[PDB]
Design a protein around this ligand. Sequence first.
Ligand code: HEM
Length: 110
Amino acid sequence: MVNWAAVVDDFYQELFKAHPEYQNKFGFKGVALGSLKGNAAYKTQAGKTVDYINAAIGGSADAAGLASRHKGRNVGSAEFHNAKACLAKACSAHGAPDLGWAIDDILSHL
Ligand code: HEM
């Protein structure tokens, strides 16, 4: 099956490399990017992100709910447009399908 866990790991490497300040909103704030795989808070976030992707593909994802929760962290359209770019790169590096349509569904509520 598609290695979404590896995709998500690459996504966060791309995201925090381009926008390091985004990392400050997480429980792994301050942790070196190359060491995130060994951080408990990151493991949990990465897993939830993978789950969300599998939910989006499976048809159960609550994009409105995810959008609302991100707004509740002061994360909105600008951030998700930036994330769309990083996720496209991560997917391409794994021969995985692009997830732009999934991000667009979240953007439709932001
Ligand atoms: C591909 C785009 C993204 C996806 C699929 C995604 C997915 C998720 C998911 C599934 C959660 C957990 C929600 C829950 O527990 O109900 C979450 C939480 C969160 N996301 Fe995102 N996210 C994305 C982009 C971003 C970006 C760009 C930021 C920028 C700061 C961000 C910041 C956060 C924060 C701060 C949390 C809460 C972390 C915590 O509870 O400690 N997300 N995200």
